[PDB]
Amino acid sequence: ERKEDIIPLANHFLKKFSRKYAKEVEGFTKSAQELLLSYPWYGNVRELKNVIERAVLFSEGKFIDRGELSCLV
Amino acid sequence: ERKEDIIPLANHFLKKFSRKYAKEVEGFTKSAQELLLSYPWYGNVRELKNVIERAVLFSEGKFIDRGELSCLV
Amino acid sequence: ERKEDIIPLANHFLKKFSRKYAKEVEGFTKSAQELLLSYPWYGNVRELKNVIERAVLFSEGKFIDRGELSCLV
Amino acid sequence: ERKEDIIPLANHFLKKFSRKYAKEVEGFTKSAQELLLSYPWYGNVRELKNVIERAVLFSEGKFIDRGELSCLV
Amino acid sequence: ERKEDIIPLANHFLKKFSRKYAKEVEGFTKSAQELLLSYPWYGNVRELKNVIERAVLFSEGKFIDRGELSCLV
Amino acid sequence: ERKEDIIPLANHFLKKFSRKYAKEVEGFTKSAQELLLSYPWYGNVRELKNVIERAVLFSEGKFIDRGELSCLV
Amino acid sequence: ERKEDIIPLANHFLKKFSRKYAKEVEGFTKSAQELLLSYPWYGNVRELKNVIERAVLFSEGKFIDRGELSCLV
Amino acid sequence: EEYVFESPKMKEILEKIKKISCAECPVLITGESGVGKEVVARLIHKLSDRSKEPFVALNVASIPRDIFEAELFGYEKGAFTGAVSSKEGFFELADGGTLFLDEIGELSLEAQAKLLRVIESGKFYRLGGRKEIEVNVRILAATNRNIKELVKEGKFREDLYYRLGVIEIEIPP
């Protein structure tokens, strides 16, 4: 109920971890950003924190889209 | 089959209880002693133990005869 | 069983705390004083001590009435 | 089993304390002396020591009788 | 199926116990030795161990024969 | 599903144990090697580990064939 | 296992103490000497040392026999 | 006002109760349904030394034969699927007071025994294990059936009979 938070938060996280695991990950793609906004996030902020540490590690290029995310969300 | 035991035993018991319930009961009368010897005592020593605790309590004077006993035996 | 104590005590307390938390609270209103006298005070003096530290903090103006009190009592 | 000790001892004690707490207590009354002799004194000399320090303090006049004692013994 | 064992074993046992219960029992008689060899010994070595502790205790003189044994075997 | 592993592994094991129990066992014979490859090895690597510690101990000469193995496999 | 020591030792001790506590005790009687020799003396020399200091003190006349000893041994 | 006793045989039975006063030996009451058995137990106890003490009356028929040996005594945890706590007991609740077992004949052989053991030892254990509780309860059995008979039918332990048969009162219809 704060879809206006998912994309900013997520982006926070993607930054934390991208720096924590030294990964050249800059950010999410549109396709991905959508998904993140549609997911119900039962865990809420917590679950997104995990979903993205996980997506940062699984990340291969500079961005994240339906690819790594769908694996979870 | 030890009628030579009934009167001594009985007398044991009458003593135990007369002292246990603080009753001025000294002993059985002839008339009573007879009965005790005629009873078949199926329960044997046990039944006599009860029959007399019971007779000691039911006792009113200093002795026990056909009176209280017949109530049972 | 000392309704003659509630209003004086209460007034003691309201003073302690009003001074302890630097609150411009002078005292209880009639409407409030009534309530305080009707409450059963199971905790007694203790419960009133708390009920009022709490009411002193919750206090907004110079007085306390049904308002803050009802919150509790 | 030294009832010949209770009254002398007691009297010792009543003296100790009467002097220890500056109490104008001279001694026990008959009525009291009886009680002291009937009590079983499980604690024995010890219990009597206490029973009387206690009775010396509780004492109001010059003597001690059924009054203060019964409170205990 | 080791009748060549019964008499030696038995003799072992009779020694153990004769010494365990301080009994002047030296050994089995012919008549007895026979029996021991004919018994089927379902319990085998165990049963013989018992049969003889038992026979050592039941023993009256210096030897054991049909007497005590038959009681069992 | 790695029959290309049975013979090498087995050979690993036969070495471990041959050295662990100081047994002059050099290795398996053809006849034996076949069997080892045909067995389904439900336990897999584990079962072969056991089957051979066991075969190393049971070993009598310098080699192992249908002999000791059949005992198990 | 040195019964040839008990009576000499004992006699040593009885001398030490008889002199240590100024007691007119000269020595043990036959009856006593026997006992001392039969006792197992678990404590050995030590226990006898004590048993006799103790017997020297308990001593009443000039000698020691079954009397004082039995108290212990 | 008062209670009701006036016929000779009862004018009597009341007294028998009164005498028994100073006692604690179990009592066996027997009479047809309605005769006043449970009214006598209650009176015996009003008269015993422990009148002020509790009266734990329990109909032995008012409980399925398979749960009596679980509620009379008590229950040691996890021995029967589902146990919120080792179960207390009417024996334990009746500790210090009377335990009026109504309709005795309806006791399972297993409990008939288990009672006997507690009438003599006075100690009991909840299920398998050992006794760890102290109960002082006066037994008061009342039944409308003829005990003796049941003994030849094997439905009633004899030794348990004589044990409760210390004092025996029989209420005439």
Add this chain to the structure above:
Amino acid sequence: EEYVFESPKMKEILEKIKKISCAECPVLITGESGVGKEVVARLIHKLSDRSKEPFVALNVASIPRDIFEAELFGYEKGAFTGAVSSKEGFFELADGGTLFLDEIGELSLEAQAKLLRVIESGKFYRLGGRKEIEVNVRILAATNRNIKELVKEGKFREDLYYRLGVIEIEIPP
């Protein structure tokens, strides 16, 4: 006065008891109900070296089969919902004295075993875990059923038979 033994077979059995005196091996007594079994146990023990020592007689039928293995031995805390203290034992209460188990056939296979283990080792543990107690109790089993039979029915452990079957007395009706 005295007790009663005068028939040959009993004139006997008394002596067998007397001889057994100086012993401690378990004893297996068997006779129809009422024959005097429990009277012999009691006499065996009055005669054993430990007469002055306690006599812990317990009817194996006077306790629900599910709580025997909780009271004979003992109980280790919190293993069954509700435990006021790890439960002591009749074995422990009988320590140093006799333990007359009446009506043996009525032993669960689980305890029949658990007893055997204590007849040989003499050590026991209350529930799961290990032995931490020392008990010196002479076993005295008495049953009115025919043991042997029960062995072919599988209701009675054989090895436990021979173990108690050290000394065996049979009371004729």
Add this chain to the structure above:
Amino acid sequence: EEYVFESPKMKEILEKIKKISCAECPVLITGESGVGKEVVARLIHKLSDRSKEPFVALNVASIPRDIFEAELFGYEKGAFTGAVSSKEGFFELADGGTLFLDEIGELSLEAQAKLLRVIESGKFYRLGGRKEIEVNVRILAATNRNIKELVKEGKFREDLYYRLGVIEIEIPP
């Protein structure tokens, strides 16, 4: 004199025992009741390097399933109402020697696991907490049931099977 082995299959099994001598891997013995299993364990151990060392044989059936996991291993204080001392263990008593678990199939899933852990690690803890004891005990399981079967019934842990199934001896009726 001596012991008894003369049939081919046993003339054999004796040797298998002899060879196994210099070993310590657990051993799984299986045969109908009475076939000589527990006689082989005993012989295996008389022959192992640790013959002079103790032999801790314990019937897994001779102990209520709820107290096995309390006596095999041991017990950490106050975890079950009543604990006189953290309970030692047959594992600890068998330390340095053999531990012949008879009738394995009768192991609770909980202990079947707990054993496995000690067959591999060799370390164990008494209840909740961690291992603080060092035990060197050679496992010797004997059962009369068919293990494999039990595995498809889920009553017997498979991995625990293969672990004890290092050396396997089968006694023919």
Add this chain to the structure above:
Amino acid sequence: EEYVFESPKMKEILEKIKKISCAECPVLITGESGVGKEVVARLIHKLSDRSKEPFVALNVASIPRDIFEAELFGYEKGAFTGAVSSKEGFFELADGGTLFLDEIGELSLEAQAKLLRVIESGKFYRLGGRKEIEVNVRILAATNRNIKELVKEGKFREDLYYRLGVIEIEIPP
């Protein structure tokens, strides 16, 4: 030679493992019995930065639920009858390395909590008192049950789920 991974979904899962390499967040592995869970943990750790560091795998089922909270963590002296020394811990033994808790669903609510506290704080205390030890252990939970479900059954703490649910791998039968 090598190990075995060739199916797409696993050709995958291997990589997921490889990527996770440079990490330490707990990992939750789930698949039917036998699927290779514990084989993946082991591989994850062979690949993590701490491969050379220890691997403390412990089956949560291989220990009675009442002694897990005594061996996982550790134990502060004299808190349970019998304590030879405050008990170390698998957590402490796994310090600096991996701690593979197998069959997580089998964690008591009490430990499920106690673990959570150590997954976040990383500090723990043996029983009552406070933390005085420093442990750096990477949690690796594997269970064959469906966690989520258990959460609606209340048998599994949710917050502990998401905490271990950082990285989640699911092995297909």
Add this chain to the structure above:
Amino acid sequence: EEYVFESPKMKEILEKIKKISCAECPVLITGESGVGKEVVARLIHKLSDRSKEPFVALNVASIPRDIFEAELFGYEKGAFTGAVSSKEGFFELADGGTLFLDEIGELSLEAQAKLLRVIESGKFYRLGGRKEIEVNVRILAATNRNIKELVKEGKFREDLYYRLGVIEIEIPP
């Protein structure tokens, strides 16, 4: 951006928090699971005068009831087998800051008391002996159970209630 409060009753509760700002009297928070209790504690403290000071939140359920009275407070050396140093405390770690005890009802009677003593005196001792430490910690209890009830169940000390019941906030589901 920000946090979330907009419903009347909460539009409220926020303020109550704000007012309470300048205070230190303990606070009792109560609401169903998930309602935001622990979110309010955290906010109360972000708002108290000691926001910059530590926040020592500890789930009273996340620790075995026997080790809470060892970790909350602290521990005096050698009092429980194995002590590396007299154990510090969450009370001591929370000194100068907040100590949010979650799920209060789960406090042992022993600690419920021991807390009370520290809510009034503010001094505490690690085990037997006397207080030698100075702690200034604001108590913040939150529980989802109904305290009052627990008081008639005897599971919760009343005087400890009123002590924490200085300021009481109730979060509606």
Add this chain to the structure above:
Amino acid sequence: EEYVFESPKMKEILEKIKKISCAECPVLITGESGVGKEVVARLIHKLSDRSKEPFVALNVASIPRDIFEAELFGYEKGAFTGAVSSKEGFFELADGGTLFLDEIGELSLEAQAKLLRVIESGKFYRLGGRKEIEVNVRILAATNRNIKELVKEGKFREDLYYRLGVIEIEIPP
């Protein structure tokens, strides 16, 4: 205004307090929970000669039984892992004033003794060693249990009873 005493038995008890004024012998107060015990102690002391002197009230239940004998008296350095200084004492803090031990029955046998020694000698030592401190504290015990009983249960030292039983006040519910 004032305090509250008006019923005969209390109209009394107040005076008993007043008389006791000029004394120092310990006092034993007993009444159901809430009756006013701790209110009387406080009054006794407001009335004793040492009213202006401190009042060291300590609930004997508000401290784990293993740390009471560490805080009541005091503690000699390095005797229990971790000691910042030999621990002072409530006895030492109460020196010159009153020491109101609430709920006495809850005293360990070890301290029950240790108190006795200080009620007679008035000297005490912190742990092993000897007394090196001088304390003048008037003992004031209050308990809601029946002391005498506890004496036959062995949970309460008798000689310690009579020692505190110098002056005894009983508050009626």
Add this chain to the structure above:
Amino acid sequence: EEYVFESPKMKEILEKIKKISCAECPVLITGESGVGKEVVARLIHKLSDRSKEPFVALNVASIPRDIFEAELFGYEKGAFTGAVSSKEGFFELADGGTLFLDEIGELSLEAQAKLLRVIESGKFYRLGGRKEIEVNVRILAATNRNIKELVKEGKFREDLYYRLGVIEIEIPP
């Protein structure tokens, strides 16, 4: 008036005391609780040559086992956190007089030894280091337990037994 001794065995024991007069060898008194042990010590000393000298009676149970070896003897500074002065001793206070150790069995093995050393040498040191004090104290041990037994339990040093067992008095209940 006087004291009380009139039964033969005591008519005796008094004399034994009288004879022992002129002695100083330790004395071992043993009898059930209450029999008069501590009354005899006191009398022995009233009769010894040192009657006018002090009587230092100390209950070995009235002090936590960890502080006895700190108060009996004494304490050398800074050896245990917090020491106001090297602690004197009951031995030193009893110097020149009697030292009646009540309930001896309750002596730690460490002190049982440490006493022995002082019963023979008469010299002692407070903690680590060497003896620097001269004490002439007559030992008077009294215990209600059976010493000998304790010796086979290893709870009581034998050589310390025989040392105190110079003169031994046994008070019959």
